[PDB]
């Protein structure tokens, strides 16, 4: 008569896109809609039991999270798990739920390895996956004439979730899976000046199509040094892999969008440097159901969670927890409707898999693997004003690059420079 | 009045050096000696609760083992953990015991990362550590004139415990920590013929001092291809990193020792190839207490475990579980004797750490980190007969290379070839 739902998420730390102070309300909203739908779990009273994926220091732990997951299983026997979003938290809990034959839902866990559902069985990813980033880079290379060599630069703060790694892992593995072209990679550390000589050296030696996964400040400083070293959009192109748009403001207000402006007198040289630079982000949902969700989400989070939800790309994570939780109740209702129980995880999950769905994020497609298709946006500088704006859009289910508001991808040469220079890289 | 000891080991699979069918009796022996020692835990009745580190398929699992470790904690509250031996099993259980403030003892878990006792607190390694292999390689390079460049080749079967990786990880990290010389590495797959062209190419380009971690058959085939390509002990030297002496028979009988002989008519060429080859293994204990232990161990395993314990280097793992368990009872008695309890894990562990001990394996030294020092043996071919015999010995506590039975390390040139060729590798 009641469905127990176990959550393993950062319950105290709010710095995470999947923090409970941001996913919690988004889940309240979804539970509220289920009670008001007579067609969704009729007469059921879906309860929730919570677990902190975070350890003592407040960060999500490859220990605290699985320890939390076990205490919830032996105390409540939940039918489904929610979270974690951290890769190193999600991996161990996923192996436990896959063993327990319990479904697992999360907007996080975007890494390449989570894709292996032979191990992470019953693990359905309703948020972005990094393998999906390979799809967009593949489409972007096919539709731009780069079929030889590209360069990747990524940094990580030590002891975090290693986000830029898994972003580049999912991009490297899926792009070489589909194009078999030369993809060079190099890891660095932002706070270490010793590396920047190495990076500028490798920039002009290891490729012209250059992708950088770094903080906004690191990517800016790199552009300044590139400009200083005479590297321009005629021979190079710099893709900041900034998926949550940290180098940008929200799409709601704060018009226009200037990432190169920093207020340090270097902004004048920075603007010109960013002429060779483009930013790859996620796609803000267009549907006005998103905007209503955000509104309800901000209200509900201030009221019940004493937290303020600012606008930004991060909010598709709580949004996808909301939608993914709706996707499950649908499938459980469907499973109950054909004589099955809420514990038929295999039946329940296969309903959710290979299935389109309409939630607050609009159209979302759970692929044959159990991973939401990810839509991307490409940002470019209008050489006139200097501000950035979306010029391309990648439908992830269709793998189609569509131009945005009839905008043209700025190129200093009138066309993209070639991924290989003239007479070799020498 | 009773001390609960939780074991997380392969209880059914016997292929592991830390299999329960081999460690179990070695533990029975150590428990038997404690009951007969009035000076060790007087009046105490040490209990044991067991847990299979292995999953369904019988291999040790990064999932089964921590799940096992939790049932033993919440059902018995043990005072100490024993095992796991598998790296990927131990790492998760280690983070659980370190959180639980419970000591963990194992002869396995040799990886570089287990060395970090800030994460794996109260984890005392009474067996070999791969970092310790770096120490022997360091001594071996310092006492042989190689201070420039060396080459490493390693292979692993997919889905195992990745043994050759962690062996090379511990060797690479500790040798560059101490010498800062160029150490080139290359992974390969034994069953893939496509790699052997790649390997022979790298042999004659990436160094002359060459270490190989592979199966005996793979290392042999490589030697034949090396000989075929005209690579001899005049310019090269090939160290098989065969720690458990899989390419050799037991030190008890089966005289003499020929790893190049295979009974396929290629043996004639194999002997000559192995003239440039040397084998790095662990050190068989000299003390006659070991030999009595083996005798009691084999009897006790046939009788109570219906398992037959063949002779060989693998047997120092159960031997070190035996000694490590004695090391703990000592310290717990010591801790009870100064008013402390069996749960004073930090006090107990610090007694065990930085401490020499006399056990069935003879002299063993738990270093400042909590890792038994590892003694290594170097084997070489007697050019007369072609058989291999120990020519060097590395005391791990003292880091001294001592000649064995007045034997000389055979060199075709009268001295070791230089780690770098004449006018470069070109």
């Amino acid at each position: 008569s009641d469905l127990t739902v176990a959550v393993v998420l950062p319950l105290t730390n709010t710095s995470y896109p999947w923090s409970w102070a941001r996913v919690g309300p988004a889940v309240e909203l979804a539970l509220a809609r289920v009670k008001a739908r007579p067609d969704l779990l009729p007469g059921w009273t879906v309860r929730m039991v919570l677990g902190s994926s975070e350890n003592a220091a407040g960060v999500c732990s490859d220990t605290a999270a699985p320890l939390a997951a076990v205490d919830l299983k032996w105390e409540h026997s939940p039918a489904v798990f929610l979270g974690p979003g951290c890769v190193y938290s999600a991996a161990p809990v996923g192996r436990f739920t896959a063993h327990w034959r319990v479904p697992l839902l999360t907007a996080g866990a975007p890494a390449l390895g989570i894709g292996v559902k032979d191990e992470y069985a019953l693990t359905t990813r309703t948020g972005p996956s990094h393998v999906k980033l390979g799809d967009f880079v593949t489409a972007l290379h096919r539709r731009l004439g780069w079929e030889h060599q590209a360069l990747v630069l990524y940094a990580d703060r030590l002891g975090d979730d290693r986000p830029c790694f898994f972003i580049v892992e999912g991009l490297y593995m899926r792009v070489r899976e589909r194009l078999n072209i030369t993809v060079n990679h190099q890891e660095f550390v932002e706070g270490d000046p010793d590396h920047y000589p190495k990076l500028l050296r490798a920039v002009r030696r290891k490729g012209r199509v250059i992708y950088i996964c770094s903080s906004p400040d690191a990517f800016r400083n790199l552009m300044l040094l590139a400009l200083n070293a005479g590297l321009t959009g005629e021979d190079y192109v710099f893709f900041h892999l900034d998926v949550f748009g940290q180098s940008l403001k929200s799409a709601q207000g704060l018009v226009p969008q200037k990432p190169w402006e920093r207020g340090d007198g270097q902004d004048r040289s920075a603007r010109q440097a960013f002429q060779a630079a483009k930013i790859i982000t996620y796609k803000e949902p267009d549907n006005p159901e998103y905007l209503e969700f955000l509104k309800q989400l901000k209200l509900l989070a201030d009221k019940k969670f004493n937290f303020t939800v600012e606008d930004g790309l991060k909010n598709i994570i709580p949004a996808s927890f909301h939608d993914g939780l709706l996707l499950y109740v649908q499938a459980v209702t469907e499973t109950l409707a054909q004589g099955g129980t809420v514990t038929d995880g295999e039946n329940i999950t296969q309903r959710m898999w290979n299935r389109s769905f309409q939630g607050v994020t609009g159209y979302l497609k759970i692929d044959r693997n159990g991973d939401r298709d990810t839509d991307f946006s490409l940002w470019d500088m209008d050489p006139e004003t200097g501000a950035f704006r979306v010029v391309l859009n990648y439908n992830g289910t269709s793998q189609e690059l569509m131009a945005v508001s009839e905008h043209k991808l700025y190129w200093p040469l009138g066309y993209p420079p070639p991924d290989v220079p003239k007479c070799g890289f020498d | 009045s009773d001390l609960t000891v939780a074991v997380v080991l392969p209880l059914t699979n016997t292929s592991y050096p830390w299999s329960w069918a081999r460690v179990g009796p070695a533990v029975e022996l150590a428990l038997a000696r404690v009951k007969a020692r009035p000076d060790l835990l007087p009046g105490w009745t040490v209990r044991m609760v067991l847990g299979s580190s292995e999953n369904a398929a019988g291999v040790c699992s990064d999932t089964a083992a921590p799940l096992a470790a939790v049932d033993l904690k919440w059902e018995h509250s043990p005072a100490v953990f024993l095992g796991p031996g598998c790296v990927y099993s131990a790492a998760p259980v280690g983070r659980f015991t370190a959180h639980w403030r419970v000591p963990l003892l194992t002869a396995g878990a040799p990886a570089l990362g287990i060395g970090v006792k800030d994460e794996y607190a109260l984890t005392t390694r009474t067996g070999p550590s791969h970092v310790k292999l770096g120490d022997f390689v360091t001594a071996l390079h310092r006492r042989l004139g190689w201070e420039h460049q060396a080459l490493v080749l390693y292979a692993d079967r997919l889905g195992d415990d990745r043994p050759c990786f962690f062996i090379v990880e511990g060797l690479y990290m500790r040798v560059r920590e101490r010498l800062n010389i160029t150490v080139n590495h290359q992974e390969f797959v034994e069953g893939d013929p496509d790699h052997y062209p790649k390997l022979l190419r790298a042999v004659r380009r990436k160094g002359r001092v060459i270490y190989i971690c592979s199966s005996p058959d793979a290392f042999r085939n490589l030697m034949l291809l090396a000989l075929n390509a005209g690579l001899t002990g005049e310019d090269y030297v090939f160290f098989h990193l065969d720690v458990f002496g899989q390419s050799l028979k037991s030190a008890q009988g089966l005289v003499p020792q020929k790893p190049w002989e295979r009974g396929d008519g290629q043996d004639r060429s194999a002997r000559q190839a192995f003239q440039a080859a040397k084998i790095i293994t662990y050190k068989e204990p000299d003390n006659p207490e070991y030999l009595e232990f083996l005798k009691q161990l084999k009897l006790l395993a046939d009788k109570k475990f219906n398992f037959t314990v063949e002779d060989g280097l693998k047997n120092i793992i159960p031997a070190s579980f035996h000694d490590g368990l004695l090391l703990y009872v000592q310290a717990v008695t010591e801790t009870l004797a100064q008013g402390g309890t069996v749960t004073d894990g930090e006090n107990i562990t610090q007694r065990m750490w930085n401490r020499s001990f006399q056990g069935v394996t003879g002299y063993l030294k738990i270093d400042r980190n909590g890792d038994r020092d590892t003694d290594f043996s170097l084997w070489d071919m007697d050019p007369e007969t072609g058989a291999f015999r120990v020519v060097l010995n590395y005391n791990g506590t003292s880091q001294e290379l001592m000649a064995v039975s007045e034997h000389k390390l055979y060199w075709p040139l009268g001295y070791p070839p230089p780690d770098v060729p004449k006018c470069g590798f070109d």
Partner: peptide, 15 residues
């Protein structure tokens, strides 16, 4: 590819 040395012990964050 790359030789990941010291990068944790888990079949997820390793290469």
């Amino acid at each position: 590819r790359s030789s990941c040395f010291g990068g944790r012990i888990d079949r997820i964050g390793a290469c």
